[PDB]
Amino acid sequence: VSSFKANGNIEAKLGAMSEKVNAQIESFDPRTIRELELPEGKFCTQRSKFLLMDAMKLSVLNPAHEGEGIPMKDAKACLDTFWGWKKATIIKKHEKGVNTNYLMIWEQLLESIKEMEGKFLNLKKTNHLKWGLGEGQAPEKMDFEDCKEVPDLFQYKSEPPEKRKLASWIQSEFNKASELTNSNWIEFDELGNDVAPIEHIASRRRNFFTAEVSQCRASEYIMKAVYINTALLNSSCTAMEEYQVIPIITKCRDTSGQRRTNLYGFIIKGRSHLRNDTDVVNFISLEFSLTDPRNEIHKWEKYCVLEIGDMEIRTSISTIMKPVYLYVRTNGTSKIKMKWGMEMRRCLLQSLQQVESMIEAESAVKEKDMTEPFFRNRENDWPIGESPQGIEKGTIGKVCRVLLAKSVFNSIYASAQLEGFSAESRKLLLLIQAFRDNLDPGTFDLKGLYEAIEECIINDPWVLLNASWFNSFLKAVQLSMG
Amino acid sequence: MDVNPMLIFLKVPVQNAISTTFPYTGDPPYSHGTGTGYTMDTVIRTHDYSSRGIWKTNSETGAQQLNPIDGPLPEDNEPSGYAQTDCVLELIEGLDRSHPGLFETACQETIDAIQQTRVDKLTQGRQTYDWTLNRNQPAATALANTIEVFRKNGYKLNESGRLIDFLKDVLLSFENDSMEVTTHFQKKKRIRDNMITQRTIGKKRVKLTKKNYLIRALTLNTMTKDAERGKLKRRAIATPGMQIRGFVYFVELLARNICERLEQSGLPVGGNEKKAKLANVIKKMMAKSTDEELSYTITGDNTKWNENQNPRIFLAMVLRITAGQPEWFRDLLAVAPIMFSNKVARLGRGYMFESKSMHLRTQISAENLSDINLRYFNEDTKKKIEKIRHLMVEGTASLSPGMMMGMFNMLSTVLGVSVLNLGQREILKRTYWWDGLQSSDDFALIINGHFKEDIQQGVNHFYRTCKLVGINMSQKKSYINKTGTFEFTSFFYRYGFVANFSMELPSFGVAGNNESADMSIGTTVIKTNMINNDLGPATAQMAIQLFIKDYRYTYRCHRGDTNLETRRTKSIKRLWTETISKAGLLVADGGPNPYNLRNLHIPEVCLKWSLMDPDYRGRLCNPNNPFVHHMEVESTNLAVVMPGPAKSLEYDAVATTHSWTPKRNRSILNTNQRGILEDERIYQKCCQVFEKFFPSSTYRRPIGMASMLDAMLSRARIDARIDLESGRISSQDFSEITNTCKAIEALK
Amino acid sequence: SGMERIKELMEMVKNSRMREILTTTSVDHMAVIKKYTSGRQEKNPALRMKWMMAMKYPISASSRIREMIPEKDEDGNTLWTNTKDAGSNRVLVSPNAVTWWNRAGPVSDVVHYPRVYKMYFDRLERLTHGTFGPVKFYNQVKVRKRVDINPGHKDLTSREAQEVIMEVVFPNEVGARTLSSDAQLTITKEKKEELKNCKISPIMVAYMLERELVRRTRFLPIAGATSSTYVEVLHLTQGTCWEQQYTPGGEAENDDLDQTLIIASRNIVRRSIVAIDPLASLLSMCHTTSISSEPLVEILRSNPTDEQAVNICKAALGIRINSFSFGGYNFKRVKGSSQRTEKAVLTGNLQTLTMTIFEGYEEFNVSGKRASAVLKKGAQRLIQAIIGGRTLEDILNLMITLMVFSQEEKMLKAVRGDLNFVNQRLNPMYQLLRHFQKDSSTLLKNWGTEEIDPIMGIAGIMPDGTINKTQTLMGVRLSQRVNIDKYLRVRNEKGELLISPEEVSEAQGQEKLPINYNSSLMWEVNGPESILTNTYHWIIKNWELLKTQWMTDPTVLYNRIEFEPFQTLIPKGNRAIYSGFTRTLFQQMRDVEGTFDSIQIIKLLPFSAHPPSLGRTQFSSFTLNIRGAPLRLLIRGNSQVFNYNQMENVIIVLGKSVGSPERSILTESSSIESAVLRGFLILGKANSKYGPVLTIGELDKLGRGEKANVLIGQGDTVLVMKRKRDS
RNA sequence: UAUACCUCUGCU
RNA sequence: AGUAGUAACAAGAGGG
Ligand SMILES: C[n+]1cn([C@@H]2O[C@H](COP(=O)(O)OP(=O)(O)OP(=O)(O)O)[C@@H](O)[C@H]2O)c2nc(N)[nH]c(=O)c21
Ligand SMILES: [Zn+2]
């Protein structure tokens, strides 16, 4: 080393080295490239911790703050707003389940609510409940010596996930998530008074954002997520050995500003000796709905759906009575999962950042605060949909709700699949963008990238939907270009 | 209509709406159970890439060591580890040529460093593998244990108090064949009750073999990396031992001083500076070119960066960089590459088995992977066992070729940088030429020339020139286009660097240090993002708004005029009604939020100072309060954050009764390490009292080789004297204090 | 007393458990054992805190809390427990303890705490006394630059601070070093005076001082003011598309003021030079411009800076440029100028003095006590000194004074021994004087001698003090109203040129304090990126107006005063040939019908605003001097400067969108491209049938009508034909 | 063997 | 059952 000097080694070694070692640029063309390969199998099921578009509220008028009062009392109060109950009957079965146990659980819970006083409600450990909350289902731990010579002792199943196919419903769910409602869902804490002009401007712009966002259905999911996950974390930490009842509550204000408490259903928490951040709490979700599962039965694999009552509704011209279903299910969560569910409000930031940047981007070039134009001077000009007519341009207020819904769904259906997919497809998008900027994009091993992407599309409705969206986008780009 | 957020990309350029592709508002992926499979996958793949190299048994260890360096050149694109020492040395020389007197000053600094370095500078930093306990431990302990064991055996140069005198001992400790360690174990006595069994811990001396100690001192620990974004499958990270740390520190300290004076080195500088270097290189690469030349940027990732970075190459590098300097210094730094080239890797927790019929589960030590029937396992696993067994030594697995994430840094970049620094017109003298920026596996390379084929030539040339030093460009993930747009470590340049706010979203929330700190952090997160990542006014306002909501809920410190019902709300109500000037109360005491865009840089206490009730502030800032525990200046107002591996975060706050620490983990109480708590409890009470005799000790570390008591006494005299002589004390009290000072000194 | 500590120490040393440790582990080791803990750094503190805050007793506090506060509060909440914190003699406690303390614990005197926490309270102080102006909306180009973070940094190095801290907080336990300067001593005594008897943990004072004294820098993206006080509020000051004009409380800094004034004056001059009646164009800008919300006029009136542009402005505004005094004598500069470079240099005894050395040819009338002289000075050079006086002594004194003032190597090389002249220690310039006055014995031995031509009246002086007709000391010879014109040339009363706008340099760095021009001649935003973006914006905003003006009456268009700021970016000599080249390229587009490239017109148009020259030189690009480095806008195709993006339908200048052109322009093309080469039409891709390919320098040996292949730019071979007519 | 309890632990 | 996803959780350890 000390007495080394470079004569001309690298060039000699390059001379010696084989010509199969090459970085051959294949020039890239979006018109040439094919659609991403979606997986096939059984259709993908709903895997949320609470019902989305198919949720149903029993609501009551209530002037309380947006986290005040005794939640069981608020629940009881909501229960009374529904008149026409029934005897419970199973209408859509949980194929792998003891479907009696759900029907007994509902009644046990529904009676336990009627027979309680105070704040805390713990159910009694009945076998049918124990089964649904997975009591004892951990195998008993032993030293290896003492179980060396058992025949069927294997290592735990460690295969990849079973592939699944893109059902429609997720796009529907997103389409609803992307819509306005007739209720204010988000209630922001106070700020320091404005002094700087830019603060006034900021607040002016923030009012619009709050307007477009607080009514958006995504925001209703955010609040449910936050309440459920806070409640569940807290109860998990405080009552490790009890089966605590947590009523699924949100508080809102009508378009009148009249304050309202909603009850979506009940959650029965299992035992929660949560040590590692991945350790699981089993729980039972019991949620009201008007939706008939049987018209989209693939969507509800994990659920046992009971019929629990009836009520009247008016359409445009006609008016008719419908039955009310209770979607019952066993589900699970983890300290890390619910910690992140508590923080879902950050979606608002993800959404609003992108919009504010788009407003500012124009405001710069127009040399003027372009907010009130963008929101008030209503012009449909950002492509945000695809109909049988074709590509559908929307408004900034829509873009807010779309991006918010995206960010929310990214939170609700978080998954290594999405994690990879999102990371890799970005490169393909950038390769498209480079072509569409006429920068002569080149790739070395494209099908490697296609396989790296396609590797991450296994069984997640959200990731499937995104894969699909990418294809629709690719085609949409190909058409306009070719 | 069906909504497709990606359709935005029709109108808006990807880089301008890149946020929508970053799903960072949901829980990231986390490994459950063990990462023995991943460690074995890494160890396997690592040899699998170097398979053509030469196998040899180590005499001192007996490990199957594969050597690929200077081996047969690869004849396909696949990930190869066949680096060429001459081809390295050429580049490392070309670097010296290109930077006149770099290595001189670089070394000259490291010399004075090595001379001036205390042992204390090793108690700082990350967790290390503690060969004493066969587990990971905090640096301060993991060191203290090795020093105590070194002291119990015949090794006490470090008693000097200088890092090289410890660093010496480590090489001598390889000689002692019978190394004495004290192991702890649980026993069970029988106690009466005015009769029940009683657990209690006892100690047991064990002596380890040359074979063992040498393995243990060349052992690196493995884990699964959790919370890793962007990736479908989990990866195996590693942790270094207590021996190699001291050398790694100096090698990295040299490689740092090397990097700090290189335009193509991404490390150790922050994103703003990285972007400035990436500007500089483009500005220069344009300003040097001619109007009839092309410019192509490669968005570049290097596949299997660690797996194919060899320690012998690092030996070559570290030697060649030191060439000309004192041979003790040339040797000292060469230790780490060697010790790495003889590295063995622990295989983690092992495996867990389940019986469906019996409904029982059991755990298995990785150490048991030698003597174990393969009927339990599946194909992929049992085959990984089959492959690992041939490399397996005393519980661990030999790992001569390559490297593993988390053990070594920076120098690996210098190898990349040198391949960039090769591409000057003045060196290459071809029709083409190049420049760029690199950090670890991530690189941006601008290639200039006269024609597309002329660029292609430079691409191939670069790509092979890397292969020759064991660097493998990812043909899958890397790509190329005309200079104008590129990606680099999640920075996006589109005729200028755009914003990527989504990256930072996880930072927005209650950090969970404490009421004081969190309030300072949360605001600064909003503040720095407005500056650095285009977080606009209206959204920033809303981030304040949500932060406040999260902070209040998390700490149960809602505003004193709310009707919410928690464990605090009453005692906060009392304070609320009691208080005259409400606006002065902190948020943590149910006061109002003062923050808006202009206030974000002003600490809450400082901001609300004038508006406080002078009683309330006098209670709040009462330096006699028991909730705070007195820090040291180096660790006052500091937190920990992860962007990179793991970094400290300074924050601005006034020490209030809200500057507390939360309760410690207690799971150790059940373990055999139960004594460490008592050790700590005692150890602290010595320093606590010592600080009364040397208040200066908490600001600067007292350098001194003398018995901790003797120092206390020697002072305890003169303080007690000078308090009288030229002061205000009685000579009965002086005589009493000196009588005490003698009276204790009598006791051994 | 120091009593209970030795009681405690005895009570500890009794216990062998710890008397072991105290004896065995040394002072070096005590730092190793202090950090010894079972506890790890928490990986997920955000989660862990949300987990722990739901528990009853999550906070750990000193056991004394049990003495200090009750066990149950008024409402029946339990405040502390007897359960001890793993690895400590510390107790588990409810949040209610913290509240109970804050509402009904012991009170303390903290009224001096702002003196400890100054660094923080100065932030508030600056904000409370800040003033906001209006918000402006525009493309805000930001330079990523290293800048200061610690306003009120009394600048001294880490250990230098450490000494000062140790002095203040740890006076008896101080180490062993000298207090280097009044810099340290004054801070020490003042901060000791300020922090007198303040009831607080010394550690906090040490911390706050450590943070307060040493400089801290960061790499930040900044548009506008780069002073620390402006860096403090970037988040409030600048956005992507907006500037919130703001002046922070308290007074600006002379260095920053003097630094920024130069950059202002330079830009004023460099603008004015382009405009008709440059004096008048300047004067208005000088009247209207304001730095950091203060009038440039009232700065210039009472600011002493010597720079060529600043002097042009002072001459224009009618205020005395700058005379001065030194060593007893009065110096008045008649001709020339000098740039100031601060340096460290060695005396003949190898002592390092820190000079502010002057480089440049200068001429002085020097006078005073019994002796006058004329001096001709170069950069560390006495070119010539003609000295007269009423006594040889008085001459010689002035000779030594000037020979010093030269700053020659000779005279520094000449200094034997150390210079410790004083209790105010005089600056090196004086040190050297008061040295050499006391002993010029060596100085003259080393200064050296010329032979010279004998002249009636003039005489030479020898190193021994003799007068000699034909020999003399190197450069020494013994012998007994300003105006400014239309074009900013500074003349003396004799009519000789002192200062010329040709000699004025470019604006170097980036402004420290903010510059506010209220002048229609200048754009609303500062710097060159501004100029490019606005100049290309105005064009796009008023395109349809100017497109007809291009067709009908161009010669009016080219004289549009909106194009003037763009010209400052072009180098002096290029403007004419660039504008001629451009104008010819446009004319070609008119003379050859069919071809019409609106984007090419938009791109090059701003170069057209100057009286053109008749040269026939080719140009592949035009250079532009922006922030120092020259940027080359390519004539053919996109560039780093001008980039027309069709996907967006946007012109992008230096990374920022300048606007969308008419959608008409997307669907607009023709095989023939005019307005690229002079007398040459482009006819699509290069055909090899017209031979081996040529370059741009080799296009003056082609027939009128002859087709030929040309390497035109960005690695493109193109078919080019020489046209018949001459535009 | 089974059922009841009781203790410690929730990142170690 | 359910969570989950390349391996775990579905309490662990002790009074044996
Ligand atoms: C060596 N030299 C000194 N001066 C001036 O002589 C005077 C006395 O010189 P000085 O060194 O005492 O000045 P001061 O202590 O203000 O520090 P400085 O301004 O950084 O030098 C000052 O007004 C200097 O500007 C000079 N002025 C000009 N024009 N040219 C020179 O070479 C020169
Ligand atoms: Zn609140």
Side-chain angles (χ1 to χ4, degrees), chain B residues 690-707:
Chain B
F690 183 95
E691 285 158 1
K692 299 172 181 287
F693 299 103
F694 298 86
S696 179
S697 65
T698 62
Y699 170 47
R700 159 168 258 189
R701 296 285 154 281
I703 301 163
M705 180 163 52
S707 159

Side-chain angles (χ1 to χ4, degrees), chain B residues 291 567 663 666 684 691, chain C residues 34 54 58 84 102 621 632:
Chain B
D291 295 316
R567 291 158 172 170
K663 68 190 281 186
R666 319 203 84 205
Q684 284 297 121
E691 285 158 1
Chain C
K34 171 146 191 168
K84 312 220 171 195
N102 292 345
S621 64
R632 275 186 279 100

Side-chain angles (χ1 to χ4, degrees), chain B residues 254-282:
Chain B
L254 179 62
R256 182 166 199 178
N257 290 320
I258 296 293
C259 282
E260 283 178 32
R261 302 169 183 77
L262 291 168
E263 277 271 40
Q264 298 128 300
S265 182
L267 320 174
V269 305
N272 291 291
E273 196 154 14
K274 283 183 166 69
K275 289 166 191 195
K277 294 200 169 185
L278 282 152
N280 276 289
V281 298
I282 292 163

Side-chain angles (χ1 to χ4, degrees), chain C residues 506-526:
Chain C
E506 186 164 9
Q508 292 165 11
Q510 196 179 331
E511 54 256 52
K512 280 282 190 182
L513 298 170
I515 298 165
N516 192 23
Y517 312 101
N518 300 33
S519 186
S520 56
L521 292 164
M522 217 79 205
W523 287 121
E524 193 168 30
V525 193
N526 299 68

Side-chain angles (χ1 to χ4, degrees), chain C residues 324-326 333 338 340 356 358 362 364 377 405 407 427 429-430:
Chain C
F324 61 94
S325 67
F326 167 79
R333 202 177 71 193
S338 63
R340 318 186 67 181
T356 63
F358 299 78
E362 294 176 284
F364 303 87
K377 214 205 77 130
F405 187 90
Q407 310 178 301
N427 59 65
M429 269 293 102
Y430 275 103

Side-chain angles (χ1 to χ4, degrees), chain B residues 500-720:
Chain B
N500 182 13
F501 178 69
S502 288
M503 191 59 52
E504 308 298 322
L505 280 161
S507 74
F508 283 71
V510 181
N513 291 245
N514 58 42
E515 288 159 296
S516 174
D518 289 350
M519 176 66 71
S520 174
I521 295 162
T523 57
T524 316
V525 168
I526 295 164
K527 191 192 81 198
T528 58
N529 269 292
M530 288 172 83
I531 295 162
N532 290 287
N533 301 296
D534 295 6
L535 176 67
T539 302
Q541 285 187 331
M542 206 172 299
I544 297 159
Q545 289 187 303
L546 300 170
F547 173 78
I548 293 290
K549 173 86 82 193
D550 200 353
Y551 184 101
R552 283 174 164 162
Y553 265 99
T554 296
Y555 290 109
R556 321 296 142 107
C557 64
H558 301 272
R559 213 168 81 174
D561 61 341
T562 62
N563 292 282
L564 281 76
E565 172 52 39
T566 76
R567 291 158 172 170
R568 306 188 82 180
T569 45
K570 289 183 181 166
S571 190
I572 296 177
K573 188 85 175 197
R574 296 312 185 75
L575 175 57
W576 174 271
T577 49
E578 175 196 289
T579 301
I580 300 172
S581 179
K582 303 273 203 287
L585 295 151
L586 293 171
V587 169
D589 297 317
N593 169 39
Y595 287 98
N596 201 308
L597 278 32
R598 76 198 185 286
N599 309 134
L600 290 167
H601 67 278
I602 297 165
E604 206 195 349
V605 163
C606 196
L607 193 62
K608 284 186 178 152
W609 189 261
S610 300
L611 299 147
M612 285 174 207
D613 286 17
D615 278 7
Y616 160 76
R617 99 146 83 70
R619 305 213 188 81
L620 179 60
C621 307
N622 191 327
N624 202 238
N625 83 106
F627 304 103
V628 180
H629 62 107
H630 282 114
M631 303 302 301
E632 294 166 309
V633 169
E634 70 170 57
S635 65
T636 305
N637 282 12
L638 269 180
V640 181
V641 165
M642 297 171 65
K647 298 173 188 180
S648 71
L649 173 55
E650 69 210 34
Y651 62 86
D652 293 318
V654 168
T656 51
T657 52
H658 302 113
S659 302
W660 45 258
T661 47
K663 68 190 281 186
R664 292 264 298 282
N665 175 255
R666 319 203 84 205
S667 294
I668 210 78
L669 293 172
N670 300 328
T671 67
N672 299 127
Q673 309 303 290
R674 205 173 193 284
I676 292 175
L677 302 186
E678 185 58 39
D679 295 11
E680 189 179 339
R681 182 177 302 102
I682 297 287
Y683 279 138
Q684 284 297 121
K685 204 160 280 177
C686 301
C687 313
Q688 190 191 325
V689 71
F690 183 95
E691 285 158 1
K692 299 172 181 287
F693 299 103
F694 298 86
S696 179
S697 65
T698 62
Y699 170 47
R700 159 168 258 189
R701 296 285 154 281
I703 301 163
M705 180 163 52
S707 159
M708 197 186 316
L709 188 51
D710 297 7
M712 293 157 79
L713 291 160
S714 309
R715 187 130 190 170
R717 295 192 190 285
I718 185 162
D719 262 296

Side-chain angles (χ1 to χ4, degrees), chain C residues 176 178 190 322 464 510 535 577 632 638:
Chain C
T178 54
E190 283 179 47
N322 192 37
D464 68 18
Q510 196 179 331
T535 298
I577 197 76
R632 275 186 279 100
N638 292 306

